[PDB]
């Protein structure tokens, strides 16, 4: 229904200067992807607090509220409410400055994900190589919760927190190249509009590469060595308390929200009842945004249940276990993918 | 029901069906039963109405 | 509810003893305590499973006896009144001492109508005893829940 | 490295408090008497706190630094406490925290 | 030399995500499983006949043995006596257990003779001081909790009262009884025939 | 007069709201806590989905629910 033509129409009337109206519409669906972004961080946290329980026989959180669902409000207003201490010889400029770091470019890459189309945050043409770009900063804000802390238990766990996080964006790159090959280029809405009646069952290998290095992040106990709590106790994280440990905690579940939509959009797409949909009109158009909308969050629901369900099916890895994962599995087996969708779309240019 | 006496259970809603203990307390309708047996004494509080005195 | 203002206050100042059948999980009665004290009474609770006759703890002074284990031959402390203490030691701008057990379900009627009785003597003293169960918190005069 | 002795209010360590910070230093033995208020100090009990301190590390230390001594020099505090607590010079704060009696009940005496 | 690695090389990388897939199903399979939770407060669980928790004491059995700090590891139950002169008589004027210190051994209720000294199914002790866990006379009786009678709780069984080939105890008839009979239906079954 | 399309679509779009977050959620609820002990693992995931889709709504009205069990009758 085009509500931005609305908006602005509705506001031209009275007046408003209508590059100032056009000026005014900005932030409301900037704030509206940060609703859905603490939203989904608060789904994944009691998500993985009641499926964790269900693995076990187990039963999670019930006396909160009615199901555990007001258990992270409770942590986040904790962790508020908790006092912050600055240790001894750590610095005050970098202590309080490592976790907005590792947490901004996060939320900053919710710019890309449609939920439906023309229902996104302004279509960028470069798009996912802007996401591989931005999780490459990161490492400097756990490098510097490693630096900025007397703790040399943290700064052991904090470089080998920018060994891996710098050790899969190469095949999580070369994943994504397979599909700029498809899609005539970058943007989200191209990579997905190739997709009219998907990409997985034509990058059968990509989607391994790019989804072990998604969870390879550390987010998950397949890995997540630099929170390896029974290795040495929370690596980087244990000198933060109050609220800066809430940041860490929010920009790891935020950030697997965000590769559970990414998942969604790059091989299968956040539309697309899998029958040749628009074949069956504003009426019309609100139905199909909700049924597009829907079928994403099924598919990401689906990415975040299989993350969080190999966090308890497989025990981690050292240090050398894993970085034999890279270079050794990922990156090798990505250069073939590539290799191969280009002799493909070479040789068999219909279809790609 | 009265202190002293010996009783019986008769409640098979009840882990504590068919022991005879000597009675030791009696408070407010609840009586104290003890089961002198195995090697510990137990001591546990039945209703009036899940005993039998048995003789 | 979710909301509650200071009525259980004026209930309790009417009454003088009721008794919270708050849920088994210990978290939605302390505001009320709070309400309390943010009048200007004062709390103390001790537990009721620990205390005794609840005439010599109370009101007259009496002697207690601690663990000996071989050492120390037995020796008493005397410890003295619960009620005549703590009620001579509040602050100036003191309304009363209120009295709070946790654990009711183990204590006797006997003792709740002495609870409550013990409410009109010696005045500036009121009571609340914890007898868990409902699964929202209400309350009821002490006097009452027995006979 | 610090050599502390920290019970309950009595914490003592090896070093000399700048701000906040300690700095072992090997001769300055700061003293920490009830950080966490289980008592209500005047300025003179706590005065003969400071004394008994005083004269029970200069009158009787002439041995090693070792955390042994530290912690014999806080059981003896941790008595004389009991002593001026028992004797009625100081006593509880009676605040709406813990009121836990760590030293004893009280008595009346007889 | 070359083939052969890379065909180990795939072999591998196969078996480790079978083996990855097994615990996969597994998992997901627990999660059908009903849970062995025990909804503590609300859904307590029943003590066995021989469950040692708080001791008991009457007033009016106790002579004065002094078997009861005898027999305690540390002499723990402060008995005092006056020894009244009628004829020989003990006459018991004070009984203490500080349960901040007691253990729970019950060889005090093992060598009580007169059946006075007993063990309760009281596992509920918790005070915001330990000056109140020291129990008197008249506050060691006190007529035990008995979890099943309260109106808010589901009790539930434990292992060895659940009928033989049950192991759980959450959704159980009511009729249910241990494992077998007892000796007195044995021997009056035995009897007659 | 008010057959005007504009208006019905605000009206329906309100009313996707409406029902969105405060009737589907309590629907949730029930389904969810009918069948939490006796459910499958299928069952499970789809119900877990059908709280996450409906999430900003279950943290509005969860504040007035209380499912504690109800306590039983125990004379009989
Ligand atoms: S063992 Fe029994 S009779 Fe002897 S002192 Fe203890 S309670 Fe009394
Ligand atoms: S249970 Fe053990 S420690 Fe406690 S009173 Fe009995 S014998 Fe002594």
Redesign the interface.
Known sequence: ?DLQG?FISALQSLGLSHDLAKLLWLPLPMLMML?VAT?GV??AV??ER??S???????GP??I???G??AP?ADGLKLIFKEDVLP?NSDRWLFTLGPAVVVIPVFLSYIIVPFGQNLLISNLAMGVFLWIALSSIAPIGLLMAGYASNNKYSLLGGLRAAAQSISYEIPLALAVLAVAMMSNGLGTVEIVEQQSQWNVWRQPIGFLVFWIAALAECERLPFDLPEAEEELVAGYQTEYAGMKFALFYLGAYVNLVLSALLVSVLYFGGWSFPIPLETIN??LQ?AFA?LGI?MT??KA?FFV?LAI??R???PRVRIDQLLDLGWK?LLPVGLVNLLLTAGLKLAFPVAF | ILPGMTVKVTNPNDTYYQFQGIVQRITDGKVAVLFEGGNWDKLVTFQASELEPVV | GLLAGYQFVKDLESAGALALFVPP?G?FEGRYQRRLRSKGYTTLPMSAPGLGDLAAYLTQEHGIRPAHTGKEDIRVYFQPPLVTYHLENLPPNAKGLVLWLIDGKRLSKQEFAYLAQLTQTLPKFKVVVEVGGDRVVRWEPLADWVA | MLLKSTTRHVHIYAGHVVDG?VHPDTETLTLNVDPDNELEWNEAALAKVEAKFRELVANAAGEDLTEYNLRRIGSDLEHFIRSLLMQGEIGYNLNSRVRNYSLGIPRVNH | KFLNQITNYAKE?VQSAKY?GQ??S???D??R?????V?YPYEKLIPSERFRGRIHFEFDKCIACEVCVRVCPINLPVVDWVFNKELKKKELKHYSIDFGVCIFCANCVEYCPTNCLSVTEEYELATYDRHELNYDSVAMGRIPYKVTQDPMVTPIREFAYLPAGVMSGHDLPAGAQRAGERPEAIANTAKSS | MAVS??LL?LG??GA?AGLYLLVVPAIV?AY??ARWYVASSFE??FM??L???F??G??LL??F???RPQPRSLNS
């Open positions: 229904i609305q609703i939203v608060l789904v009691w998500l009641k499926i329980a269900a693995v076990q026989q187990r039963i019930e006396y509220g009615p199901l669902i007001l409000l001894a504003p009426f609100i909700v829907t969050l099924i629901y249940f369900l190999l308890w099916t497989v599995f | 999980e978290g | 910070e | 990388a990855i615990g996969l597994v998992t997901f627990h999660m499983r009903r849970p062995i939770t909804q | 399309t504009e679509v329906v779009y996707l609820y969810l806590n499970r995931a877990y989905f709280v996450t889709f999430f900003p279950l943290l969860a504040p629910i209380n499912f």
